[PDB]
Amino acid sequence: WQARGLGTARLQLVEFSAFVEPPDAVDSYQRHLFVHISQHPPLESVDVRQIYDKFPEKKGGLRELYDRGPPHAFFLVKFWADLNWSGGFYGVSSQYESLEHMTLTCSSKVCSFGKQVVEKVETERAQLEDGRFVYRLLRSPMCEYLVNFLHKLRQLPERYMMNSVLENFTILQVVTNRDTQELLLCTAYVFEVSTSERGAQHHIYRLVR
Ligand SMILES: CCOC(=O)/C=C/c1c[nH]c2ccc(OCc3ccccc3)cc12
């Protein structure tokens, strides 16, 4: 019963993106996508151990979460960030669907060298749509650490330097049932940069053991 997308039977990712809109968007709109998954054969597995030291350790790190299970809820998403896009609006949008009606809690731990640097925790109540429940965390403003990290990481003079920094930069995303405390989706994000004739791109893996 192996997964084909980033999701389980209980909770599926529908869309995610991190983006920026220039000031001139209020005239002629446009947004620039740093990264962007869109899910409108089984994925390739990656042993979770090979990424242990890239994430937190005591309580809420990769291993201690994988030991609570469910193992099938764990995914690795490798990003190629488009970093070729100044005083504009930086944002993140997430969307999930479910068959059952829950109140999600959604944690975004940003880690530098595996140290938890910045965390955001949100909750979202289900809204019933076409026979199914829908969870919408659209346009959350990026935390100022991420915005600043990006202007710095944009001004670096070489891509290989960019990917060197980014090798110590990861994000853990943990969605759990707020009521029952059980885990529904855990997604480790590792990052590189994209030779921006190509925009963003991504690979989704099942974390296994
Ligand atoms: C909404 C409040 O918290 C935040 O600000 C962000 C939370 C995130 C949760 N999962 C993510 C996946 C990627 C990402 O940024 C992409 C990105 C990173 C590095 C270089 C280039 C691009 C942000 C998040």
Curated annotation (Swiss-Prot):
It is found in: Nucleus. One of its GO terms (cellular component) is transcription regulator complex. Keywords: Activator, DNA-binding, Nucleus, Transcription, Transcription regulation. Residues 1-209 are annotated as: Transcriptional activation. One of its GO terms (biological process) is lateral mesoderm development. One of its GO terms (molecular function) is disordered domain specific binding. The keyword DNA repair does not apply. Transcription factor which plays a key role in the Hippo signaling pathway, a pathway involved in organ size control and tumor suppression by restricting proliferation and promoting apoptosis. The core of this pathway is composed of a kinase cascade wherein MST1/MST2, in complex with its regulatory protein SAV1, phosphorylates and activates LATS1/2 in complex with its regulatory protein MOB1, which in turn phosphorylates and inactivates YAP1 oncoprotein and WWTR1/TAZ. Interacts with YAP1 and WWTR1/TAZ. This is Transcriptional enhancer factor TEF-4. It comes from Homo sapiens (Human).
